[PDB]
Ligand binder design. Structure first.
Ligand code: GTP
Lengths: 924, 336
RNA sequence: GUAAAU
DNA sequence: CAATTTGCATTTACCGACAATATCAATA
DNA sequence: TATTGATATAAGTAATAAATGCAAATTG
């Protein structure tokens, strides 16, 4: 059924409201059935399939696959019951401390209580689905890696146990998950049977036989063993023939009921499925900090912004869907779709008595061909799954609940089909609600078409003139999308341009353009968002002017400026002998310098710029494989040109990086109750934490993960422990502080703007930097954007950041060396010797830290006696407070506990941020 | 004839790329007396001989002086050693070249296209009396080169298309210990298996006396190594240096399937053979239990197995109807 | 590796 | 301290990345 | 009596020392 067309045909708005209410109350049940995962339902499905196929007959079909799965479960259940009974019989007084071989000692007590809780059949279904779900994953040709399989089984059992528990605490360690998974997987290896057919090398005749469906094994890769589970080829073909995705768990799909509003981090998004506000991969510190902030109640605005982002309804486009369907039905590769590849082709076997270079080349050719074939197959499967979702959800309300990564940027829950996808997935989505085009709708729609061609740096007048100069082309391209002028496929973003051409054709055909109702979103794309935020932070003038902060009637583009600078530099340098200039002088385009310049302020080294320009030079005819010399030369020249172009941003970058370096090399006082045991060098357990204006706390996890071997029934898996703590990473914190800070400031701005737009009754959809609204409400959206950016950047954010660092890392001690000839060093030596000569220890730094903590406890408490004692108690840290120039103090030696100081803020510029209210050419 | 270098000239050099060399002519004299080169090579005058990684070249000079072969060629790419050899052996009948032995293109171009050094192809029945090769791969991380040459022995493509070419190879003591293990020892691995299958080597010289504990004590008697002090090698710091002689022998098995079986049966070494056959493929354990009738074989660990029963296991595995992609995989395991 | 953002 | 070394901007998602396992050594 | 730390595995995506691509960093 096509509910969208019925809604559009509704004459009266009251009728529309009644229809929406009826649709929601009817579709609650459909959402409930769509959201629920099928384990027990899979059980009776398999049972019914087996009982119905027992009467009809026996074949080798998908029904036969379900029958054999039912038989596998039926044979599993006695084994699981026997194992659980064996575990339960051990719960009596534990007479033997170390007898019963090693299984009883190391595994029976290890995972006894864990298996006895969940129902056996649920775990059997979980493991069967888990193994039949991840065929050919992790680099294995026809199987999965053992560690990934066992860990996934353990986590699935965790989720099932928690789902049972809430309908009636603790989260299991990684080792327990690994052991449970290994036990179940080994049992299924034992009990898996399937009939196979093959040829005999002696009889040359078919010999029917039975072999286990799953078989453990090991494979090598560059001198490293790698455990692997293998699946028989017959099961592989049956899984391939099992439609596309029928029994393999579909878990995350767009909703139909309006999403549940966010109130706390645990409750949000889907109705009956738990969700989290932050996508914490494996870190517990982020979860703890987010829970503390939510309990305090300082993230309300984030909740409102996410609710507004997830409250907008979507529909699947119809004409674009028809075009995609007609392109896909040809079974080939279009400009965008890679296509479907039929067969796998290989070069013939070379003679073994040939030079080893020939064999090596043949091996590389085979590997490359296999990788290309598999990449094409994966892309085809992804596009096919997207099209299946689009066809299934055609003509019905779609809602996209959102979350935030640890920085704060918003991403939808639906991973496969969402508005952040590629151009094909972006074309297939339009707003459910329709708005009156109005006097300004035509202009903005024409601007959108103009800037989907790449013409986004032209004045609005030039853009509308260009759009109106191609009315015949638009009409021809929209009247027959395929087998015609093919003008839409020449766009920079083809399918969005096709949809906008449809909308323009309809509005041109209409006699009265003002009353036309259009559902097409209009992309208002921010220009150099990172540079804009850097200019707003530092308060620069020239940097603000070059990034369209100041009001002007003509676009200013930094990427074009740097491209022209590079071209002039090379032309001056091309006179004598620069053959690299001969190859690349006029062939320098805005894209390469755009990428390099835009990433430069985040700390891109030479290798990153080289790789970026090499990637953006491959389709520029220079070469297909070897462009590294040209790329290196161009990176050198680009760095030489940009070294002086940005100055205010670089100071903030350097300050943030050095602050990250200082924080990541500091040890606190309180948690040092247990000595670091190295005598001299402690282990650092401090990570950069800061709070954005929206209140969301960002904790850079960036920890050095240590992996160990934990014994399992199958093998010993090499895994890490997420719950376990460990020292932070030295380089990642410094390398990621400024990118994270800039990528969180714009996310905060987007959240504020979305909240205001929702308060103003608008439809808002934001792809990170860019924001989508209707073609009519663009003016109000722009006003809201400017107002909210002004409110966000009316304060010196870096000053508040330094204040937050000072308040949080208040009593932190760094370790550093001092010159022995210094009088202060001699005083510190005298104090340490006087304190620790009678105690016995050789003035160990741990005792000094403990006594400094004691001084902090005494002299900071408001007790008069405690204050007097603190005045009568002096330590190394307490003594070293006379001079505020800690760096200038030090400028062999003995290390002491230097206090943690952060550098002075870079000088804030004299620029008025408010001026951009009239700067129309700032975000468009 | 050819002036042998001395210790002072060697110490004047700066970089040796980690390769350890011996520089006393007495040890080379006794090694050549004991080694019995002249018995296998009926006419050393007509012998055409190739040398790999010469370096110092003292052994080169001693060999040429004592035997006077038809053509003895030095293949080097290291700059300092090449300059040293060019300076010392100026105008010598010794042929100094500048090519890198690591690349197969070096041998291909030097033999086929350029025809500078053309050995004569003989039958694979007896030792090629007209061709001899010498290698000095003593680098820390250059074990892969030796192992690839060992594989090329079986495959017969690199230099063994000419027949049963004898090699006098210098290798680190640990590599020799890995490559000279006997069934039941704790140093047994696939490298030892391929060495035993393709060649019948005999250790000749070894630096560290205490290092002899690693090898099988039974075989030391008929090997009779020549012991020389650790201070004899110029790069005194580093691991000991051993010598092995390579004599390829005829084989009656298929290299690819035997290699697959030995590689997948050496991952689990200490596990009994009863439960390790499952690693070969789906259901291989049942078939191998049915086919094998020697129970002592099933009670033996893969370390205890010698190459004969490895060939046997390969033969049983060929007749198995439900064999996996042993060759149909075509060495496609992982791209990353 | 491919797509998405700066 | 001058000489040698290490990794290479951040994020999300998806597929085929995710240095890993087994056996012999040392210690609590 | 377990519990850790060490080492080989494969075998062209090498090693070495040269000369960086350039900080920014151990470290000997
Ligand atoms: O070029 C990549 C690619 O071939 C492969 N690779 C890495 N991650 C994946 C993945 O998730 N899926 C597939 N199919 N292939 C993958 O590894 C090659 C080399 O990677 P790098 O060593 O450059 O490391 P990284 O993944 O971080 O590279 P990049 O994506 O930042 O360029």
């Amino acid at each position: 059924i096509n509910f969208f067309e019925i809604y559009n045909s509704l004459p009266t708005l009251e009728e529309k409201k009644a229809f929406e209410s009826a649709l929601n109350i009817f579709n609650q049940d459909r959402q409930k059935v769509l959201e629920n995962r099928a384990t027990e339902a899979a059980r009776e499905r398999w049972k019914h399939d087996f009982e119905e196929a027992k009467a009809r007959g026996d074949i080798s079909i998908e029904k036969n696959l379900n029958v054999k799965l039912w038989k596998w479960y039926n044979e599993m259940l006695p084994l699981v019951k026997e194992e659980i009974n064996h575990c339960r019989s051990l719960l009596s007084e534990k007479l033997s401390d170390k007898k019963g071989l090693n299984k009883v000692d190391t595994n029976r007590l290890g995972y006894g209580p864990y298996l006895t809780l969940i129902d056996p059949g649920k775990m059997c279904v979980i493991t069967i689905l888990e193994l039949l779900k991840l065929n050919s994953t992790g680099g294995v040709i026809e199987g999965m890696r053992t560690a990934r399989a066992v860990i996934s089984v353990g986590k699935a059992i965790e989720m099932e146990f928690r789902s049972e528990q809430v309908l009636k605490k603790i989260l299991w360690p990684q080792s327990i998950r690994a052991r449970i998974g290994s036990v179940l997987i080994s049992m299924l290896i034992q009990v898996a049977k399937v009939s196979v057919q093959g040829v005999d090398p002696v009889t040359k005749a078919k010999v029917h036989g039975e072999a286990p469906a799953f078989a453990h094994g090991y494979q090598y890769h560059n001198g490293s063993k790698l455990g692997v589970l293998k699946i028989h080829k017959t099961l592989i073909r049956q899984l391939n023939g099992e439609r596309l995705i029928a029994s393999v768990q579909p878990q995350l799909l767009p909703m139909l009921v309006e999403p549940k509003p966010w109130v706390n981090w645990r409750s949000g998004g889907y109705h009956y499925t738990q969700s989290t506000l932050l996508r914490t991969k494996d870190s517990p510190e982020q979860v703890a900090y987010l829970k503390a902030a939510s309990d305090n109640g300082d993230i309300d605005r984030v909740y409102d912004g996410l609710n507004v982002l997830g409250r907008t309804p979507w529909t699947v486009n119809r004409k674009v869907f028809d075009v995609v369907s007609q392109v896909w039905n040809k079974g080939e590769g279009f400009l965008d779709i890679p296509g479907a590849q039929d067969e796998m082709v290989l070069p013939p076997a070379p003679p073994k008595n040939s030079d080893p270079s020939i064999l090596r080349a043949w091996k590389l050719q085979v590997k490359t061909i296999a990788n290309k074939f598999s990449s094409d197959r994966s892309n085809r499967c992804d596009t096919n799954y997207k099209l299946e979702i689009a066809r299934a959800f055609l003509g019905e309300k779609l809602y996209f609940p959102h979350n935030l990564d640890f920085r704060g940027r918003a991403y939808p829950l639906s991973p496969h089909f969402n508005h952040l996808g590629n151009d094909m997935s972006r074309g297939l989505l339009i707003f459910w609600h329709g708005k009156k085009l109005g006097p300004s709708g035509l202009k903005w729609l024409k601007i959108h078409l103009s800037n989907l061609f790449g013409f986004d740096k032209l004045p609005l007048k030039d853009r509308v003139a260009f759009t109106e100069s191609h009315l015949q082309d638009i009409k021809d391209s929209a009247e027959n999308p395929l087998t015609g002028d093919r003008w839409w496929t020449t766009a920079d973003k083809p399918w969005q341009a096709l949809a906008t051409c449809f909308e323009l054709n309809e509005v041109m055909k209409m006699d009265n353009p003002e009353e036309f109702i259009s559902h097409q979103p209009v992309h208002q794309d921010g220009t150099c968002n990172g540079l804009q935020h850097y200019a707003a932070l530092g308060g620069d003038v020239e940097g603000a002017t070059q990034v369209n902060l100041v009001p002007s009637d003509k676009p200013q583009d930094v990427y074009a400026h740097v491209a022209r600078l590079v071209q002039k530099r090379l032309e001056i340098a091309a006179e004598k002998g620069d053959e690299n200039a001969k190859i690349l002088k006029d062939k320098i385009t805005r894209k390469v310098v755009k990428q390099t310049v835009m990433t430069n302020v985040y700390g891109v080294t030479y290798v990153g710029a080289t790789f970026q320009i090499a990637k953006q030079l491959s389709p520029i005819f220079d070469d297909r494989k070897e462009s590294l010399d040209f790329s290196k030369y161009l990176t050198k020249h680009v760095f030489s040109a940009i070294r002086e172009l940005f100055h205010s941003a670089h100071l903030i970058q350097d300050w943030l990086g050095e602050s990250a370096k200082r924080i990541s090399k500091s040890i606190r006082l309180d948690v040092d109750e247990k000595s670091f045991k190295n005598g001299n060098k402690p282990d650092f357990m401090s990570s950069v934490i800061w709070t954005t204006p929206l209140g969301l706390p960002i904790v850079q996890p960036y920890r050095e993960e240590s992996k160990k071997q934990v014994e399992t029934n199958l093998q010993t898996v090499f895994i890490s422990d997420p719950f376990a703590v460990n020292p932070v990473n030295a380089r990642r914190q410094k390398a990621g502080l400024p990118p994270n800070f800039i990528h969180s400031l714009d996310a905060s701005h987007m959240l504020l703007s979305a909240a205001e737009c929702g308060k103003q009754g608008l439809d808002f959809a934001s792809v990170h930097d860019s924001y989508w609204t209707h073609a009519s409400d663009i003016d109000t959206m722009n006003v809201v954007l400017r107002e909210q950016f002004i409110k966000l950047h009316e304060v010196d954010l870096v000053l508040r950041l330094k204040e937050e660092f000072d308040q949080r890392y208040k009593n932190y001690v760094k370790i550093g060396k001092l010159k022995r000839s210094t009088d202060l060093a001699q005083k510190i030596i005298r104090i340490r010797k006087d304190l620790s000569r009678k105690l016995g220890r050789s003035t160990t730094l741990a005792d000094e830290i403990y006594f400094e903590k004691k001084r902090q406890e005494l002299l900071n408490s408001p007790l008069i006696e405690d204050r007097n004692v603190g005045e009568k108690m002096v330590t190394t840290v307490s003594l070293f407070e006379d001079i505020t120039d800690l760096d200038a103090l030090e400028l062999s030696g003995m290390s002491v506990l230097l206090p943690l100081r952060l550098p002075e803020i870079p000088p804030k510029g004299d620029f008025d941020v408010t001026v951009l209210r009239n700067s129309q050419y700032f975000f468009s | 004839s050819v002036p042998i270098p001395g210790i002072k000239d060697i110490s004047k050099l700066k970089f040796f790329y980690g390769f350890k060399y011996l520089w006393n002519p007495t040890v080379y004299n006794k090694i050549f007396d004991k080694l019995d080169l002249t018995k296998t090579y009926k006419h050393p005058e007509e012998l055409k001989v190739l040398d790999l990684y010469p370096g110092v070249g003292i052994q080169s000079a001693i060999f040429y002086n004592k035997y006077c072969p038809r053509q003895y060629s030095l293949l080097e790419k290291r700059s300092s050693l090449y300059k040293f050899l060019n300076a010392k052996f100026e105008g010598s009948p010794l042929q100094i070249l500048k090519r890198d032995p690591y690349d197969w293109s070096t041998y291909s171009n030097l033999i086929d296209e350029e025809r500078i050094f053309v050995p004569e192809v003989q039958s694979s029945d007896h030792i090629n009396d007209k061709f001899l090769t010498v290698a000095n791969v003593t680098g820390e991380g250059s074990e892969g080169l030796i192992m690839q040459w060992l594989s090329c022995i079986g495959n017969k493509n690199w230099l063994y298309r000419f027949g049963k070419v004898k090699m006098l190879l210098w290798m680190p003591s640990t590599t020799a210990r890995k490559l000279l293990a006997r069934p039941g020892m704790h140093s047994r691995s696939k490298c030892s298996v391929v060495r035993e299958a393709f060649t019948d080597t005999k250790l000749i010289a070894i630096s560290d006396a205490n290092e002899l504990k690693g090898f099988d004590s039974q075989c030391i008697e008929e090997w009779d190594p020549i012991l020389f002090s650790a201070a004899e090698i110029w790069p005194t710091k580093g691991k000991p240096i051993a010598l092995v002689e390579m004599d390829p022998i005829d084989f009656d098995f298929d290299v690819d399937n035997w290699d697959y079986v030995t590689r997948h049966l050496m991952i689990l070494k200490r596990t009994p053979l009863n439960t390790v056959m499952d690693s070969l493929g789906h259901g291989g354990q049942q078939y191998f239990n049915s086919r094998i009738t020697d129970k002592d074989l099933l009670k033996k660990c893969p370390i205890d197995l010698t190459n004969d029963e490895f060939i046997y296991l390969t033969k049983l595995f060929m007749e198995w109807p439900f064999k996996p992609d042993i060759l149909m995989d075509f060495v496609d395991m992982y791209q990353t």
